[PDB]
Design a protein around this ligand. Structure first.
Ligand SMILES: NC(=O)c1ccc[n+]([C@@H]2O[C@H](COP(=O)([O-])OP(=O)(O)OC[C@H]3O[C@@H](n4cnc5c(N)ncnc54)[C@H](O)[C@@H]3O)[C@@H](O)[C@H]2O)c1
Ligand SMILES: NC(=O)c1ccc[n+]([C@@H]2O[C@H](COP(=O)([O-])OP(=O)(O)OC[C@H]3O[C@@H](n4cnc5c(N)ncnc54)[C@H](O)[C@@H]3O)[C@@H](O)[C@H]2O)c1
Ligand SMILES: NC(=O)c1ccc[n+]([C@@H]2O[C@H](COP(=O)([O-])OP(=O)(O)OC[C@H]3O[C@@H](n4cnc5c(N)ncnc54)[C@H](O)[C@@H]3O)[C@@H](O)[C@H]2O)c1
Ligand SMILES: CC/C(C)=C1\OC(=O)[C@H](C)[C@H](O)[C@H](Cc2cccnc2)NC(=O)[C@@H](NC(=O)c2ncccc2O)[C@@H](C)OC1=O
Lengths: 263, 255, 249, 260
């Protein structure tokens, strides 16, 4: 097992199509002992290979964050610490992402999306670093925001902020001998993405997303399967392992290499 | 016979005569531009400072966090420049982050309300200003924002770095919208300007002049102001959604 | 009143009137610069092309692979501009890659002799020209090279893309040397100037559009870098590509 | 082990301080079966590779020799057995004459020397991939060694230019490798001590470059230790980064993500 004996916190499980669900499944297959967070979820988490305690965590709730380390210690047992943390939380209201014009997103919506998608990566690291072992690893989920694109809109801005937050989290994490990195994935057909392909956002957005995904598989030298999240989950586990011990404040691209090719 | 002869340019962000916006404004006027200035909160203080500029320019109130100020902005600019006239340039020179998110305070101790305020003013407002002003901008027009390279983390800058990373992303989307009006949108990434953390910030500033192949004078905003004017001119007509580094070339050198 | 009034600028790379160097030279003359031109191999043909320019400018021979041409260059430029005068600007607009390293030919089938020739002319020569000309450059001066964004691989450009990646690296080291003379060194990364799908994709991604038949926006960008308006920019790349490189789709 | 049953070719062993020596050692500790390639000092390389955990066949390979490249796949097949293919290829070759790297002014490097350095350090990555892709299994991995050339630095000079060319070559090699279901990536390492031989000026510049790394790296950087770099190469040779290609993984203590 790649993660044999490691105690890992995994956030962001909502459905069995969430990348966190696949990260947690592979982490358990690789011998990790998990602690899960959520804010209904118990039903979904019961579908994982092994039973894991589920803790309540609303990242926008400061009381949940202040009590988190103590609640995790209770779940893993006094004297034990975490070796890993997976931040797999991302949100942007429909005004800031999708069909809505970029200029029509109110700041209250954009701010909510940035709180959950970017700032919470620092919040979780602040709460959990005091109960992390040296050699530990914090991993977040990204979508390459280096270039603008249709529809992603203000979520592109939140991902750009997340990448910046990750570099500062690495500075803090380093004091504990802990690494902090992001996995930039290619398009993933989740419960939300499938509906857009299904035409829930209209024919215009449906065509734009179809062109975005078809372009990915053709640019990716090894191809890209938007229905298979496993290569992304394995990449997160590689960062949670001891096999990338000199990588921190960084971004690993699990995108079929699409970002390295123009056409 | 100036670089910006006949151009109507809005310049936001003048607070003191050491503000980058003050030099941008002085250089633009020396190069024959007609200006419209915007000010936040300290309006009477801004009026006295703008009295030191080469030519008189109308001063308009603009709080970027105020939606009413943004909805009325185009109308108020049109009144100032005259009906039938449009802007050829827009300078966004606004940046703010509370002390909890910038300086000596630990990165982890910044409350989100403070970070959100700083991101609103420093990054989101670039889209707000472009939304308000694009309907009154001429083709061939130029929107310029002020940046500080956030590609790498650094001591003390903390959440302001995060806000600059957001700004660069906003700029790329603003360019998509601006292009529909034949308008460019770009940022000028400047080197440090003198407008435990103290020692780290001092080493950051000294390191700039040594890495910069042409050197860097942190007491001189003029090279930065000239760079903004180059982007406001017709001399970079195929550049948009981009970043021009007026940093002495420091970002291109490791040591 | 021109942007480059009184400036003495060397412009290399004119072969045809469609050369980016030709439009750089035309715009710089329109803007009051006094030019010195350099040409390679087909000198009688280059002279004819340079007669199309607004003003007469001396044409000097320069084969960047010829060490004797490089060792005599400063002396020959000084003869053309007059003793006691120095250059304020240098434009490197030279690029070459044999057909084995560029086009339909498989990436793996390019012999190293061909790749080496292309890298010599397209990348190393930027350092060669700066070495020869910085001793005859004025403070506040500007060296500009022509680039095509090589950050990502693409079909057909193959080994030329590798040569552009080398050029960008060379430019950063040339800036270190140039700075000692108070001189800037930068590249202009242009969009395509007239594979078809690559070129059509450019105008659609560019927020302000891209006209591949028009070299003027690129020529103006080079002149902006030759002017005194970007005095704190060096070892850098300015993108005159309609902003295509900042957009995914 | 991480690389159990995998057949991996490792080039670039010259001394027991070569990053390739450590790559080979970690790969063997992790169950890989190796084929080694050596240049010029073959008898000397044998003495070094006798210091590895297990015995591995050593093949001669001069990357500037087109005959060595044309016969390479056949010679590898003989060493691993007919019907078997490689799952991994490690390019750990770098060279630049002293005229292009060190104390010598950047402008004083003759092109013949720069060209030789680019041939060995950048072009040979495409040469090795061309020779070995026909004898590589799907899911396979090609890894090369890099040093971040995004910014200019003192003394590295023309070797930085060669690394910038290598990164570009890697992106094109990924296009070709993808047709075989093979990944191609580079590992950008921090400085590794592989005295005053360059004088006081260069010595001070190089010392400041190296000390700056450990201070910028949030997890620190041990320039005497190649193991974190060797483990990173093995992570890319494994099946744990299956959607990464034409890319660069930084095993530099995170120094490149920090300004100061
Ligand atoms: N000073 C430097 O070292 C430096 C370096 C690189 C970039 N920059 C950038 O240049 C720009 C100008 O900074 P400066 O150096 O002139 O400092 P500054 O203090 O003079 O400018 C910041 C301006 O933001 C304005 N502002 C704040 N809140 C506002 C609000 N609610 N609505 C409207 N305006 C508001 C202030 O009134 C002030 O004029 C900023 O974006 C800054 O990040 C500065
Ligand atoms: N055309 C485009 O799409 C495009 C795009 C971006 C950048 N550029 C770059 O702009 C530059 C000029 O290219 P262009 O498109 O104007 O084409 P071009 O064919 O007109 O220019 C290439 C020039 O290089 C010269 N040259 C070749 N070998 C030489 C040698 N041994 N010594 C000296 N000069 C030599 C040729 O004589 C010619 O004048 C090149 O660096 C090219 O890569 C072109
Ligand atoms: N040492 C460091 O600080 C450091 C840092 C980052 C990256 N790297 C890279 O790691 C790689 C390995 O270098 P190293 O540090 O182990 O030094 P090294 O000297 O031990 O390895 C370089 C190898 O290249 C081989 N070589 C040279 N010319 C050759 C030719 N014509 N044909 C075949 N092989 C040839 C040599 O025999 C030698 O084994 C290089 O690509 C280097 O740039 C090293
Ligand atoms: C513009 C089209 C829409 C409507 C979305 O964008 C996508 O689906 C893009 C094209 C990609 O498929 C990405 C791929 C991805 C998926 C999960 C984590 N990182 C990246 N999805 C999200 O960013 C999606 N992110 C997540 O589901 C998410 N999940 C866990 C952790 C971080 C996340 O960003 C989500 C925000 O994106 C979308 O909804």
């Amino acid at each position: 097992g790649l993660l044999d004996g490691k105690r890992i916190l995994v956030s962001g499980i909502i459905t069995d199509s969430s990348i966190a669900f696949h990260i947690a499944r592979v982490a358990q297959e690789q011998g990790a002992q998990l602690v899960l967070t959520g804010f209904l979820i118990q039903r979904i988490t019961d579908r994982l290979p092994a039973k894991a305690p589920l803790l309540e965590l609303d990242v926008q709730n400061e009381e949940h964050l202040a009590s988190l380390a103590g609640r995790v210690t209770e779940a893993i047992g006094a004297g034990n610490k975490l070796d890993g943390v997976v931040h797999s939380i991302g949100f942007m209201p429909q005004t800031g992402m999708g069909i809505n014009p970029f200029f029509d997103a109110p700041y209250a919506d954009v701010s909510k999306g940035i709180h959950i998608s970017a700032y919470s990566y620092a919040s979780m690291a602040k709460a959990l670093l005091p109960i992390m072992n040296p050699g530990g690893s914090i991993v977040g989920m990204d979508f390459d925001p280096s270039r603008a694109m249709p529809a992603y809109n203000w979520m592109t801005v939140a991902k750009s902020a997340l990448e910046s937050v990750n570099r500062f989290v690495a500075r803090e994490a380093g004091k504990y001998g802990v690494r902090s990195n992001l996995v930039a994935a290619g398009p993933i057909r989740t419960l939300a993405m499938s509906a857009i392909v299904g035409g829930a956002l209209g024919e215009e957005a449906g065509a734009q997303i179809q062109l975005l995904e078809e372009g990915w598989d053709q640019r990716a030298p090894i191809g890209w399967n938007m229905k298979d999240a496993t290569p992304v989950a394995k990449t997160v586990c590689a960062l949670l392992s001891d096999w990338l011990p000199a990588t921190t404040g960084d971004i690993i691209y699990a995108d079929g290499g699409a970002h390295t090719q123009l056409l």
